[PDB]
């Protein structure tokens, strides 16, 4: 499910759904979300997260070969742990996205 991992710093960053969306409108909502997440990745900056921690996350993904809420929680804990141990006290993993693709994207606000 998850062969790739990306971490992006997105400081600025939830959708109030339309009430009686048709089938075509649901499809267009999914397409809109994909396109906007592409733009969000493109305009965001790479994380300070060093290569070794990236390899640790890659190993966590390769061990299960399938993403789940518990795995995303463990990845969040690892990333936040590195950030807080490095001196970025208000660093926070705010989301994971692009879950429909082979590449899990981790969103962090670094602060400090």
């Amino acid at each position, epitope marked *: *499910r998850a062969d790739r991992f990306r971490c992006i710093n997105v400081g600025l960053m*939830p*959708v109030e*759904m339309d*009430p*009686d*969306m048709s*089938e075509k409108e*649901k*499809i267009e*909502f*999914f397409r809109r*979300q994909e396109r906007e997440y592409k733009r969000r990745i493109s305009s965001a900056r790479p994380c300070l997260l060093p290569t070794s921690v990236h390899e640790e996350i890659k190993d966590m993904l390769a061990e299960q070969g*399938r*993403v*789940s*809420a518990r795995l*995303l929680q463990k990845i*969040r804990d690892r990333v936040q742990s590195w950030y807080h141990e490095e001196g970025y006290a208000c660093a926070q993993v*705010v*989301n*994971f*996205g692009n*879950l*429909n693709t082979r590449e899990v994207v981790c969103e962090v606000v670094e602060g400090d």
Partner: antibody
Amino acid sequence: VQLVESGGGLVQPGGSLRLSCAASGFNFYYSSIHWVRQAPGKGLEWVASISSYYGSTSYADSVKGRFTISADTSKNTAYLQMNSLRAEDTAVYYCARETYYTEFSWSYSWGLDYWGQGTLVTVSS
Amino acid sequence: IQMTQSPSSLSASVGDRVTITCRASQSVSSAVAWYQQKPGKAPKLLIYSASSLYSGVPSRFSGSRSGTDFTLTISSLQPEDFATYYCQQSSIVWEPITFGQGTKVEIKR
């Protein structure tokens, strides 16, 4: 939009059975398929789900390891392979469609809106 | 995570207001759906996202959320409304779905 269950019947304990769910009328790559069962005189029990959009499968703990959910996306069909069947698995099995979006922080579901007519599985010697 | 419905069953007359509650147990959520099932038939979706009326469902059905407590209200109970009603939660990252135990609604006459 229609879902049709097939493959139910009578099977001995410890046996195996493969149920199929042919779902016509939508884009399989954007909706999850759920198997939900109802034993006689008991409530609805969610069994398993497969999302083609997120490429994921999920199982209830009561069937993990015995049941395998899968999908043939070209045929618009989902499958529930049931192995090591027990008397307590005797039930009406329905398949249902759920349009489902998720991130880590939030998600959205339009409900299990389309349901099949159900197929009875009887596990008895 | 558990979904605890209340009451287990109830009886009310044509025209009455019926209320069914459902508490999400051991987790917050936001995606709760309500279903109506006739005996031996496939359940029918009534409400999604805890407040949104599904296509074709009469407007006497309504839903509301107060934290982890969700409520299905039938405003003008009709004779064809006898059924078992279920709540259901859909959490993040395709986590397993859970149904409530169901509330059986009988018509008093």
